[PDB]
Amino acid sequence: ERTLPKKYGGRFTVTLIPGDGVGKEITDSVRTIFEAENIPIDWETINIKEGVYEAVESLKRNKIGLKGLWHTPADQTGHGSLNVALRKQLDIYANVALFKSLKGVKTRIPDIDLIVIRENTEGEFSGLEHESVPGVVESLKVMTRPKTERIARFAFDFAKKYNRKSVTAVHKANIMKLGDGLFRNIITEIGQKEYPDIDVSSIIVDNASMQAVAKPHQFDVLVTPSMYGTILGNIGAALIGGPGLVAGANFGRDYAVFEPGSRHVGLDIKGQNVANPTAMILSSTLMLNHLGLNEYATRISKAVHETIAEGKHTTRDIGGSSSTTDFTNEIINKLSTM
């Protein structure tokens, strides 16, 4: 059992990767709520251009991690995601984002609960591209049966475990008949001969995007390749309030890394203490449930859930006037009386 999560006499050793932007602040929020609840976990915390190595190496020891987002350049001599590098190198191939609306938050369409599972290592995130002659560029998008059967089962397994009734494959198979075709088939194919209790279906990514914005309640679980998941993800992010309310987690066979489900760095508001830690904390609770704690998780989630439902004292972006600092302390406060 050199394959479970680092643990010494009752104390887990989890990896902590604050990362860029509001990362550093939003992580801290969790630390504080954690020691204030005296949760038996010790952070091994790392900071970083190619030491994305040290993040990997750490996670390989501890098996479990909690992280924010790193920043990614758009220029030509920029380094490349290294958010994806982390996942590819650990084969943490499954991303789960949780879009469930929250009581104390004004949203245009209310009472919404949908999940978006995307494949992390393949698709348009395969990062294979070249320029044949000057001015002509080809980006190769890889889709393989093995990686696809994998995510397909993860999605169904997930839907079964969390009593989700419907699983829908998002694709563009009418145009990319081989690539997205393979994806759509393999999913529906193995949702019929295994997992027969679950409702499998397909939807074309563009039309999916339209229903998502106009009539989102029709969706339950969505399985997508790397790209479509970024897109449906952000639709879902908006639908429920914003990137600060979305819990997320990444799964591989051996490792698990928990991050915000919306995937925004918040570079612009770094150090301003204006940021919203709901995202980080909630996916932090996801991690607790994972490493079996979850008395704590059930706990500290109710804390933040009630805090934000309870009008003012909530953070800027939800419609409040409180700072990250103040919002955190209301949670730790509500928590101290449970």
């Binding site: 995130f125 563009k172 690539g179 039309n207 339209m210 009539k215 970024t230 897109i231 925004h264």
Partner: protein, 347 residues
């Protein structure tokens, strides 16, 4: 001044005061939705005679081709206005763009007066590359369980879309023009698109160029549609196909109200993007608004400003106020019939 890039070559038919325009009534609700437009156009005294043609496909060399009758017609009159058609061996709409050199999809989504949807003050404009990108035919089975779909991005194809976007943004008085991309993980592909905009940026100094990741383009638009009411967003084929169908979802919750314009170098086709609605066909329940707005788009593209503004600013846009008007799709009680005369009144 209309955009230099897809410029109409006017010339009204010297024998009549009028310009010639190919129709393509299309099938399904096409016929009814169509003459609905012919009437409204008549009433406003549009310098336009209709040369309707049929795009039902031939199959020269197994590869689906489009009939000579319709080709000659459309290449002649440099403009056409098609309604919806069914699904007859090579996408009908695809061989339609390939045979007429159409390369840019223009998709506006604006809130409609007197039709309440969940999102408000949404006024959006998006130009989409409709030539290459994710949607080139190129895909390969590299071995047993492994597939490659190939996304193609070239400067030549990018340049001329990004241009039409700057020039269209200018032609409708929007200051900002946003290049949606993902240079983050598609460094070369999307990077080229972005650089080509950044380089063109300079020969259009009246407009301001911004760059955004679809990440944010979708996040921000859904949280607050109006932040892009001074928009015009340009983007490669896929991001475009999704964002435009999304934008429509914001504006109207479906796309029975959405008009599209397919701009080519010398030709250009203007169509409604809804389907053939075969089950409502003949019963006079269709809703011309969609095609009708594409007519306006066409008018402007042709230079007939005054008529376009006439048929849009007044009429339809205004007659869609009062539930006795409207159609079944908008709570209204009116027929295609009554909508058309009810329109022409304020015409």
């Amino acid at each position: 001044k209309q955009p230099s890039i897809g410029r109409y070559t006017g010339k009204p038919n010297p024998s009549t005061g009028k310009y010639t325009v190919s129709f393509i009534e299309g099938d399904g609700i096409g016929p009814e939705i169509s003459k609905s437009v012919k009437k409204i156009f008549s009433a406003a005294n549009v310098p336009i005679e209709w040369e309707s043609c049929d795009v039902s496909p031939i199959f020269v060399n197994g590869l689906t081709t489009i009939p000579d009758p319709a080709v000659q017609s459309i290449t002649k009159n440099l403009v056409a206005l098609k309604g919806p058609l069914a699904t007859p061996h090579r996408s009908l709409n695809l061989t339609l763009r390939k045979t007429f050199g159409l390369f840019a999809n223009v998709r506006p989504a604006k809130s409609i007066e007197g039709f309440k949807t969940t999102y408000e003050n949404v006024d959006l404009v998006l130009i989409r590359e409709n030539t290459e990108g994710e949607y080139s035919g190129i895909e390969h089975i590299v071995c047993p369980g492994v597939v490659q779909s190939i996304k193609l991005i070239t400067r030549d194809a990018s340049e001329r879309v990004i241009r039409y976007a700057f020039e269209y943004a200018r032609a409708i008085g929007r200051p900002r023009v946003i290049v949606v991309h993902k240079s983050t993980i598609q460094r070369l592909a999307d990077g080229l698109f972005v650089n080509v905009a950044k380089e063109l940026s300079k020969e259009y100094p009246d407009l301001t160029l911004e760059t955004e990741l679809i990440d944010n383009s979708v996040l921000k638009v859904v949280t607050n549609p109006s932040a892009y009411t001074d928009a015009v967003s340009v983007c490669p084929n896929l991001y475009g196909d999704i964002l435009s169908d999304l934008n429509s979802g914001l504006s109207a919750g479906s796309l029975g109200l959405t008009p599209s314009a397919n701009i080519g170098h010398k030709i250009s086709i203007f169509e409604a993007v809804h389907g053939s609605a075969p089950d409502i066909a003949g019963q006079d329940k269709a809703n011309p608004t969609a095609l009708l707005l594409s007519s306006v788009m066409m008018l402007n593209h042709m230079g007939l400003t005054n008529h376009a503004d006439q048929i849009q600013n007044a009429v339809l846009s205004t007659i869609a106020s009062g539930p006795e008007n409207r159609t079944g799709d908008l709570a209204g009680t009116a027929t295609t019939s009554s909508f058309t005369e009810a329109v022409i009144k304020r015409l």
